[PDB]
Amino acid sequence: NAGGSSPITGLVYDQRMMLHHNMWDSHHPELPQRISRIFSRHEELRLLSRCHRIPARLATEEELALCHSSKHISIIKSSEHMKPRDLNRLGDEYNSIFISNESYTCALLAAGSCFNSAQAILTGQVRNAVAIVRPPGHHAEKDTACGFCFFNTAALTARYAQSITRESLRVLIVDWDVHHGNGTQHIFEEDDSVLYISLHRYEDGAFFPNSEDANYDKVGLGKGRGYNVNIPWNGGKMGDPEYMAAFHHLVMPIAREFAPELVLVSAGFDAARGDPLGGFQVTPEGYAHLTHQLMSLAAGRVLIILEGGYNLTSISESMSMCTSMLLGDSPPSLTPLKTSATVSINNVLRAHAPFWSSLR
Numbered sequence: 001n002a003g004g005s006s007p008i009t010g011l012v013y014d015q016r017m018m019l020h021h022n023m024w025d026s027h028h029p030e031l032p033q034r035i036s037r038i039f040s041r042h043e044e045l046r047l048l049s050r051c052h053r054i055p056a057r058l059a060t061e062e063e064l065a066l067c068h069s070s071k072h073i074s075i076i077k078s079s080e081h082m083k084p085r086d087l088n089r090l091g092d093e094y095n096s097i098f099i100s101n102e103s104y105t106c107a108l109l110a111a112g113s114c115f116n117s118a119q120a121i122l123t124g125q126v127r128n129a130v131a132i133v134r135p136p137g138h139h140a141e142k143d144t145a146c147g148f149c150f151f152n153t154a155a156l157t158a159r160y161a162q163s164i165t166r167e168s169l170r171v172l173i174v175d176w177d178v179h180h181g182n183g184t185q186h187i188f189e190e191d192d193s194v195l196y197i198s199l200h201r202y203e204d205g206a207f208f209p210n211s212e213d214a215n216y217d218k219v220g221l222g223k224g225r226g227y228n229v230n231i232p233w234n235g236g237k238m239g240d241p242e243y244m245a246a247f248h249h250l251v252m253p254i255a256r257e258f259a260p261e262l263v264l265v266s267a268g269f270d271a272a273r274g275d276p277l278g279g280f281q282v283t284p285e286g287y288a289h290l291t292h293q294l295m296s297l298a299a300g301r302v303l304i305i306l307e308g309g310y311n312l313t314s315i316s317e318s319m320s321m322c323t324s325m326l327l328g329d330s331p332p333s334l335t336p337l338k339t340s341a342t343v344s345i346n347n348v349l350r351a352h353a354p355f356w357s358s359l360r
């Protein structure tokens with residue numbers, strides 16, 4: 001359907017990112033095959049040849065310092081040279097981390113791939129893009145790794161984008177991974193130039209990463225007050241109706257009022273139907289509709305960054321549907337909310353109405 005003036009979608013994927021692995025447990029859910037399966041599905045669905053292929057690169061240590069401490073950079077960098085006993089001991093210093101000799105390099109490639117993709121978008125080489133990267137990023141804090149994440153790819157990309165345009169570039173990060181992006185929240189908690197909106201299974205703080213920082217009443221600090229939006233789910237499985245309602249009532253009104261100039265999606269697919277770690281029911285068509293809504297922001301400048309997601313079929317179908325939307329395909333055809341989901345949405349509305357006229 002696309003013709004000479006149709007917008008272009010970028011895609012980054014590099015099999016080097018498969019080298020990070022759990023050397024003790026080949027069945028750990030954060031598998032190398034996550035990215036190769038998503039990439040394969042893009043070939044099967046004839047999406048790859050429709051995209052402009054963006055190369056990966058490594059992030060530099062100076063770029064990592066946009067968000068991370070010198071200590072954290074140094075320690076993770078040192079893991080490249082460690083023997084298994086030390087890799088095991090180092091990983092045990094963090095919550096839910098495994099490390100191999102290739103982990104640091106893979107984390108650098110995930111970040112650099114997203115920097116290249118943001119650069120392609122912001123220079124107009126492509127309109128939007130998809131980054132099929134691992135390890136994930138959103139639990140990584142300034143000073144520590146966490147939850148399968150070493151460096152905060154999305155947060156770094158936001159800063160990188162500002163560094164190659166202007167400091168005030170308004171970046172929206174929408175984090176639809178089923179888990180709260182604690183690191184992204186904290187990195188930007190005092191920042192009004194980066195709006196963080198997370199939807200996540202919360203369960204009154206019982207669900208990983210197990211902190212009440214993920215609740216709706218954490219709205220940001222100082223100049224960042226209002227610029228941190230947590231949409232926490234309690235009461236078990238949520239799906240398309242709840243996510244569509246959260247987008248309709250919260251994500252899209254706040255985002256439109258913020259008027260981002262770049263949208264980054266921390267696109268985990270662990271809220272997907274079939275995911276045994278998330279336990280939720282978002283369908284591929286649901287993810288397509290979320291993507292299509294975000295495309296209406298920022299003059300279409302959207303970068304979808306893989307985070308979590310552990311059912312290989314589910315993530316492959318879901319991320320492919322997102323790319324299909326970015327490419328301009330028609331959204332697929334797509335109910336009362338769970339009672340607790342209405343409660344959650346109304347709690348966020350109460351918390352953020354003081355800051356966002358679109359909600360009053």
Ligand SMILES: CC(/C=C/C(=O)NO)=C\[C@@H](C)C(=O)c1ccc(N(C)C)cc1
Nearest residue numbers: 028029096147177179208270277308309
């Ligand atoms: C860290 C995490 C999710 C991160 C994510 O997706 N962050 O966005 C999930 C942990 C709690 C988990 O559920 C788990 C389950 C099985 C397992 N093995 C079978 C080895 C190891 C860990």
Ligand SMILES: [Cl-]
Nearest residue numbers: 046047048049
């Ligand atoms: Cl193809």
Ligand SMILES: [Cl-]
Nearest residue numbers: 083084085086
């Ligand atoms: Cl050893």
Ligand SMILES: [Cl-]
Nearest residue numbers: 016058105109
């Ligand atoms: Cl390399």
Ligand SMILES: [K+]
Nearest residue numbers: 175177179199
């Ligand atoms: K999230």
Ligand SMILES: [K+]
Nearest residue numbers: 188191194227
């Ligand atoms: K913020």
Ligand SMILES: [Mg+2]
Nearest residue numbers: 167168191193
């Ligand atoms: Mg600033």
Ligand SMILES: [Zn+2]
Nearest residue numbers: 177179270308
């Ligand atoms: Zn997750």
